[PDB]
Design an enzyme around this catalytic site. Structure first.
Site, PDB file in Angstrom:
ATOM      1  N   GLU A  35       0.811  -1.213   0.000  1.00 17.70           N
ATOM      2  CA  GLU A  35       0.000   0.000   0.000  1.00 17.70           C
ATOM      3  C   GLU A  35       0.847   1.267   0.000  1.00 17.70           C
ATOM      4  OE1 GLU A  35      -2.965   0.754  -0.538  1.00 17.70           O
ATOM      5  OE2 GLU A  35      -4.159  -1.068  -0.270  1.00 17.70           O
ATOM      6  N   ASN A  46      -7.229   9.369  -5.431  1.00 11.96           N
ATOM      7  CA  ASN A  46      -8.194   8.493  -6.078  1.00 11.96           C
ATOM      8  C   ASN A  46      -8.926   9.260  -7.171  1.00 11.96           C
ATOM      9  OD1 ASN A  46      -7.863   6.157  -4.168  1.00 11.96           O
ATOM     10  ND2 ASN A  46      -8.666   7.678  -2.724  1.00 11.96           N
ATOM     11  N   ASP A  48     -12.095   9.772  -7.400  1.00 11.46           N
ATOM     12  CA  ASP A  48     -13.343  10.355  -6.920  1.00 11.46           C
ATOM     13  C   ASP A  48     -13.112  11.550  -5.999  1.00 11.46           C
ATOM     14  OD1 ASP A  48     -12.352   8.965  -4.696  1.00 11.46           O
ATOM     15  OD2 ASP A  48     -14.373   8.558  -3.945  1.00 11.46           O
ATOM     16  N   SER A  50     -11.065  11.730  -3.539  1.00 10.31           N
ATOM     17  CA  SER A  50     -10.559  11.324  -2.238  1.00 10.31           C
ATOM     18  C   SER A  50      -9.060  11.023  -2.317  1.00 10.31           C
ATOM     19  CB  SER A  50     -11.346  10.121  -1.719  1.00 10.31           C
ATOM     20  OG  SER A  50     -11.130   8.984  -2.538  1.00 10.31           O
ATOM     21  N   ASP A  52      -5.764   8.625  -0.203  1.00 17.62           N
ATOM     22  CA  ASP A  52      -5.310   7.663   0.794  1.00 17.62           C
ATOM     23  C   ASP A  52      -4.069   8.205   1.494  1.00 17.62           C
ATOM     24  OD1 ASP A  52      -6.233   4.367  -0.493  1.00 17.62           O
ATOM     25  OD2 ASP A  52      -7.269   6.307  -0.620  1.00 17.62           O
ATOM     26  N   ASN A  59      -8.380   5.930   3.603  1.00 16.68           N
ATOM     27  CA  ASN A  59      -9.130   6.699   2.618  1.00 16.68           C
ATOM     28  C   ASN A  59      -9.840   7.896   3.253  1.00 16.68           C
ATOM     29  OD1 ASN A  59     -12.185   6.880   1.382  1.00 16.68           O
ATOM     30  ND2 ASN A  59     -10.622   6.764  -0.229  1.00 16.68           N
TER      31      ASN A  59
END
Lengths: 129, 97
Positions: A35, A46, A48, A50, A52, A59
């Site tokens: 990750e 991301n 959308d 958002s 991480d 998130n």
């Protein structure tokens, strides 16, 4: 801060992530590796709006608040900046809330495609603990 | 039958149970729905780790045609083969009264 592999295994074991909700400690070492590559300061966008954050790529739509994601729920009730600290206490506590939300570690895409069903204990072989 | 990557499997005059095809690198999925040719649409998202690939759209109007779109949210630089948005149309049934 970029953790060492054994260094992170001991730190997460001190936080009681071994067999937490049935997930052995090796799962969490492997999850952080794919990750964030053990980087506490990892940030990834991301598609959308958002983002991480942290060594476990938490998130910003569902778990933490970064002040820029529309419709963010902040179910961990913590600013995303706290998940960028060199101290992984905040990222571990939010990870425990996520894995206990009924879906297990399937919330981490990298764990699903790189760690699930593998020899996860190889990621703790040869460490102190 | 021919595989259907997005379909309604259960319906009421004011609600729809949609089912879609998942993909490995999807963080979660976005659901966009609105009246076909309408002036506004609604967007919702599924939760991470939810691999059921099902969702209920509710509060719809009877006898109205809706356009339902499902797309996989991914991390930038971690999309790979993710196909993108798929859409279907569904006209809800009239109400009993």
């Amino acid at each position: 801060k970029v953790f060492g592999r054994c260094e992170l295994a001991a730190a997460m074991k001190r936080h009681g992530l071994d067999n937490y909700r049935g997930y052995s400690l090796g799962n969490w070492v492997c999850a952080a590796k794919f990750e964030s590559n053990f980087n506490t300061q990892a940030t990834n966008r991301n598609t959308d709006g958002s983002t991480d954050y942290g060594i476990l790529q938490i998130n910003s739509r569902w778990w933490c608040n970064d002040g820029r994601t529309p419709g963010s729920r902040n179910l961990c009730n913590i600013p995303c900046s706290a998940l960028l600290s060199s101290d992984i206490t905040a990222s571990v506590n939010c990870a425990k809330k996520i894995v206990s939300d009924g879906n297990g570690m399937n919330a981490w895409v990298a764990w699903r495609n790189r760690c699930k069903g593998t020899d996860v204990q190889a990621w703790i072989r040869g460490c102190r603990l | 039958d021919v595989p259907r990557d997005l379909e309604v499997v259960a319906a009421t005059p004011t609600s729809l149970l949609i089912s879609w095809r998942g993909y490995p690198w999807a963080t979660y999925y976005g659901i966009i729905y609105g009246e076909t040719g309408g002036n506004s649409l609604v967007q919702e998202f599924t939760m991470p780790g939810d691999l059921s690939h099902r969702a209920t759209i509710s509060g719809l109007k009877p006898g109205v045609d809706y356009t339902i779109t499902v797309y996989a949210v991914t991390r930038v630089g971690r999309t790979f083969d993710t196909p993108g948005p798929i859409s279907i149309n569904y006209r809800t049934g009239h109400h009993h009264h």
